[PDB]
């Protein structure tokens, strides 16, 4: 639904996290492509880093797994996309 | 808990979205600081753009508002952080 993962200077790949015991069952996790960021000339620059952006989200689990009568609402951490950080702040 | 919002080349500000009718009540929404990205010299470069990274999340609402006996679990879209995108892909 979005192509930022490919257009970003800190680009990422989506990894399917499949678990039938939780809702949502599939979560697509961002994994950064490079350690550095794509600079103004299309090259990986190591004067900066690609870092994942994490968000705490609520999920519903079948707790204990497979069981029908019980469930548990809990917060988990998920990688959403990557950003580019530098050691020099201006 | 994280200072990427300040170290990113696509930096952002957190805006409190306060609603006592939903859980979580406070959601901190990323709003990009600039249209462009901070380049290798500390300047805002407009050969690229800062864009928010959105994630669909589950929230619980008092539906209808203030009422005690009923509730509704629904998915909403939230801005998590910003990334830097370029018109040229390499």
């Amino acid at each position, epitope marked *: 639904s979005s192509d930022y993962y490919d257009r970003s200077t800190s680009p990422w790949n989506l990894h399917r996290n499949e678990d039938p015991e939780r809702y949502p069952s599939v979560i697509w996790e961002a994994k950064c492509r490079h350690l550095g960021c794509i600079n103004a000339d299309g090259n990986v620059d190591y*004067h900066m880093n690609s*870092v994942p952006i*994490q968000q705490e989200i609520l999920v519903l689990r079948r707790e204990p797994p497979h069981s029908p009568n019980s469930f548990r609402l809990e917060k988990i951490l998920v990688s959403v996309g990557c950003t580019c950080v530098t*050691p020099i702040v201006h | 808990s*994280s200072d990427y919002y300040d170290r990113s080349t696509s930096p952002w500000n957190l805006h409190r979205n306060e609603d006592p009718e939903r859980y979580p009540s406070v959601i901190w929404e990323a709003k990009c600081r600039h249209l462009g990205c901070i380049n290798a010299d500390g300047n805002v470069d407009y050969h690229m753009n800062s864009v928010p990274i959105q994630q669909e999340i589950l929230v619980l609402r008092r539906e209808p508002p203030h009422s005690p006996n009923s509730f509704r679990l629904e998915k909403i879209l939230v801005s998590v952080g910003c990334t830097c995108v370029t018109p040229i892909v390499h």
Partner: antibody
Amino acid sequence: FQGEVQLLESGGGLVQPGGSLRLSCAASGFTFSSYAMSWVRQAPGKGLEWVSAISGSGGSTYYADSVKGRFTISRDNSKNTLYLQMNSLRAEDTAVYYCARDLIHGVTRNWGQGTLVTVSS
Amino acid sequence: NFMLTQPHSVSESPGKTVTISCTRSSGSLANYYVQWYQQRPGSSPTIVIFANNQRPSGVPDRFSGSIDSSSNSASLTISGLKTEDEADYYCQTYDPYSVVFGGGTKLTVLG
């Protein structure tokens, strides 16, 4: 500001060749989860030698050739603590081990106090 | 992996200027930020220069970093030299996987 980043190592001690030891580094004064962390050592009377590194999330790990397959860097971002699990320890591993905060991978900005590891029979 | 080579010893009188070179073998030095540390006897290293030429809040203008690609080397210069500057100095840089420290330079203030 100068002095707010605090890094405190523990866990050094005497171990025999082939032995195991775990180093801990308690951090404060900064948002721990958004920083890459490093382990650096110094054998007595010698220079600094980089051992290992880990990204803010813990999703990426790096090791010097000399410790690869024997050491494991990890972190608990909820406890603001950095770890180093050292297995099959050898006489060459004898050093003061320092905890380090990195601005980006390879840019070390702050150092701990150090903890002494002695590998001897 | 790669290595950084710096002199073993550097000497100068007070008020004068010293320079510590740090030469990189494998890889281009200009592609990775170079750091400089000061180490006093029995003490943890302290940062003098980060990101080639940045000074932490509290490090005097006497200390300054520079890089030179035509030689694949970084330099630390100490003008207006004082007796407190006597210590061990280390250069540090990285590649996409490794982090490497130079062998260290021992500073001696003559006089």
